[model samples]
Target: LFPPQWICCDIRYLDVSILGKFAVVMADPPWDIHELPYGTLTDDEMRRLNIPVLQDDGFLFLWVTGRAMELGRECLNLWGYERVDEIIWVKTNQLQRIIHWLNHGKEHCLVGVKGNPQGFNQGLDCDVIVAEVRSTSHKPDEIYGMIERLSPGTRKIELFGRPHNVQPNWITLGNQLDGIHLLDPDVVARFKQRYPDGIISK
Candidate 1:
């Protein structure tokens, strides 16, 4: 049983001086790629911003485009994180196929762990294979499922989110006030009716 206060502000700018010791930390930062026109920061800028935010004994899941793999690794290294695994979110629909490439996926996820094994013992054991990239900025449910299993019973946080149906123990960082009313009883009832089993992975 974790405290409700576990879910708190975006780590990028949060004052973590009082956090004592935490078990898990997850972030989907706005990766800065030089060629991408979607994100706000550049690679250099992100490197500077995230250097102090990452915890030495935490887990980080970074969302990367095809062009930002190398720079992403470098950023992780700067924060004392080591590259552990890579999970591909193969989008079934709305995938941009390139004539020269073998795969036609747009987004992929990188898993990096910090410090020694505090309690993590299981390796990557995810079953959800294909996910449709329905929204440009949202990650697929398969990825969330993997996260749920991998980081079970730990404090989780999300950065730069727009109103989501997050699991318990997970917190949001960005634009919390904009659509806070969406968590109303009526809206939740409608969502529950649509996704009866509570949004399973894939």
Candidate 2:
């Protein structure tokens, strides 16, 4: 098991000093927007951001739009992450009927692994997750739940805005995440059980 570390700086500036490597990473990088100049972050920058924090054998799942998918696909492998699979996030109404904007039914979560023996330890998870789009460009909570099942007790990193009242586990960085700890109770048990000396006594 990967040992967890405390978070203490702004990842936006690439300050990974206090932050240790992560076994799992979730990203929702800025996508190409039509009206705003908020376009996808440069490939080089994205590569550097993940390269330093991703541990060997870590897995990264990044949400991408069709434009960003085509734009950023090449760089995924450039950053030491090998693209293994892609999962579809289906947005629909309560009837489970897909709400399409001219055949735009969903987005894709590009799954990439960053080490040897690269793949999920458990059986492959379901590709399609049906959930209503409650917020703009926001993903469903089921995605995190799915990852947890695949690798419980693994330290995780989210690469954008904080999810309000969300999962207490996983360290939040690259944005304003006040009063949150990297090694919370959910994943700390395993770390403590395996390496008791790592835990900092309160």
Candidate 3:
């Protein structure tokens, strides 16, 4: 079995003492107003669950549903977090609408930083970035790219992820497909052609 690069556990009842220390935490909790077939925590439960996970001087990127904006803010307050900014993930492809007024997209990332003032990079500046969604459950590469830029050289962690594309210092709490499907033979062939030194793991 492959051990996760980062800690993979539920946030509702997270045991932060086990994490050692993490500079960044990225979460995409299922925040639906009404319970679906699979089941989800109520908004009240989510707020209570997230408060204890926040650490001083740590950064958080919370993926939230449109209608949950107000509730999301409340959660941040409960967790001793303050909203720094926000990024909109616009979907390019067609998808089923969740709400009548809702756009094709279903998620938005709310960025928050805990504790007092911390220095930010003067060289970095960007509000919005665009990327196409690869799968219904997967986020666009642009989201990852933005996080990379914001917090370079920091230990990063992700929750609610599939295991196939696990990267160095990353974690997933979902299924891990077998090696045959995980490694794309076509991609490997092209990679070997480009670099004789062998593929870089990171």
Candidate 4:
């Protein structure tokens, strides 16, 4: 069976402790884009996330919009993390229908770290990702492969994850998911103990 776990709830209300620790965390926050299909969170709301409590030392892959770039960096610092590197995602209209037009599309994922993380493999992947655009601002699947290679078999969590973001050995949490889907018995027990009603606080 796949190792992925997911819980559907308002991320702001989920008890961070119940999810346990993680070696790597990724977030694709729904920023206040002008025409995004989904709702967006305010800057203050995003900054209030208890991300630091989820990990003592790890990497945070934060996807940022053009307007939220500076704020994203600030959030990373506020969360006790420092920017180490960035991955650029170049979007194409068509997968193989290139060379027929000029392009001006890209996004950035800031690689932030805190404390001291070890046992990670480096130099196995590049910092640039060229892929076609997808629905609901979904990121390219290649990014997950890159992270898995960098930190193999580590406990990973994805904030604001959708169904497409689910993967083995990762915990994907977001309000948009269908429903609760937890594979780890320990986590399910803890979650049940914390919320007997099976509903997260809002």
Candidate 5:
């Protein structure tokens, strides 16, 4: 069994260096959606997020909302990642037909690469994800499978994670969760050493 870990803390202030590097980094940011439900990070705020420090070389699965598609690409460029490929998650109903959307029938996950990561197993999984939409902004489980196949057994991290985002072999970070829950002993020690009081802030 893969031991999962998570740090329920602010992404902006959390010490990303403590966790070291990762082969995969996934993020579903709270996009600015015309003052929609839930909190949203401003364009400037999203740009300021230091996602580059988490990985020297890895794959980034950036979920781009309808409005943030351009900004998402811009952020990837700013983070020193080159746009490689993209996956589309098409929303479907139980009947296996397109559910429909005046809003959007699908979401885009831009695949980016930084540096030269040798772990990538090229050309296995398809680029299309036809899955039923779950709760608000929740991604499909199949995307994880695609990543796992691509990177095999490598350290991964998820940013802006929620309770449902936690998974084995991945470190999740978010402000909405409860508390820090890290299972890796070495990481735990490192985290404690870095932040004695278990409070990571800027």
Candidate 6:
């Protein structure tokens, strides 16, 4: 089973206790783009991210920029992680595709490892993922789902997440969140009727 720790606050302000160690770290930094509004990930902040890493960051899933491949490697060294392998995040639709030499309807998830290399649990050996794009910067669920299958029951933490939320078994952390989802009214009513006065709070 997966325990959830969803919050909307700067990662720097989070108490160390909130994160009970981490197995995986999935971060999609709001990098400063010449065309975007959000600020970028600072080097200082990335350096401060060394904490919460229990054993090693061998299972790090970093979302890197297109064509800017060297920058990804630089970030890896900054975090004291070694480059391992990488996979592309292909957008199923053309609307989100960018006209660049590095991208052909896809993005890269630069994989890095530090300490004792955990290597990946790679569930589905398939490479070309045909997943649809949701909100901007929202990664394909298929990839992480594959990770979960490979590392069954492993507690994971998503660093610098959401820049956003989902039902996956990830202890999501970030300075922003997309809010929570809920079931149908009938399902909720039935549950409340069965277990009256169920616990619910802020």
CA lDDT of every candidate: 0.56, 0.64, 0.57, 0.86, 0.86, 0.59
Cand. 3 Cα-lDDT: 0.57
Q: Who wins the TM-score comparison?
A: 5
Compared with the true structure, what per-residue lDDT tens digits does model 4 show for residues 99-124? 21535468899999988998888779
Candidate 6 runs further than 4 Å off: 15-18, 51-54, 94-104, 117-124, 178-202
Candidate 5 residue spans exceeding 4 A from truth: 35-38, 100-103
Better of 2 and 3 by lDDT: 2
Q: lDDT, candidate 1, residue 196?
A: 69
Candidate 5 — what's its lDDT?
A: 0.86
The positional error of residue 189 in candidate 1, measured at the CA in angstroms, is: 32
Quickly count the clashes in candidate 2: 0
RMSD of each: 10.2, 6.8, 10.7, 2.9, 2.0, 8.3
Ranking by TM-score: 5, 4, 2, 6, 3, 1
Model 6 lDDT-worst window of ten: 179-188
Deviation from native of the Cα of residue 88 in model 1, angstroms: 0.6
Backbone clash tally (model 1): 0
Clashes per candidate, residues 3 or more apart or on different chains:
0, 0, 0, 0, 0, 0
* Model 6: per-residue Cα lDDT over 79-191, one tens digit each: 66776778786787655443354446777887766677454565455555667787667788787776676565676667666634444566666656644222434333544
Q: In model 1, where is the ten-residue run with the lowest total lDDT?
A: 1-10
Candidate 3: give the clashing pairs. Answer: none
Tens digit of per-residue lDDT, candidate 3, span 34-84:
589353667876776633443557677777776777778778767778888
Against the true structure, candidate 6 has what lDDT? 0.59
lDDT of 1 by residue, 1-202 (tens): 3322222233344343323333455556666544465545566666765434435566777777756678778877786788887777656764643214665655666777877756664566753347666676777767656666776777565555545535465544453424222243443465456546643222
Instruction: Kindly report which residue pairs in candidate 1 clash with one another.
Output: none
Q: Which residue window of length 10 is worst by lDDT in model 2?
A: 1-10
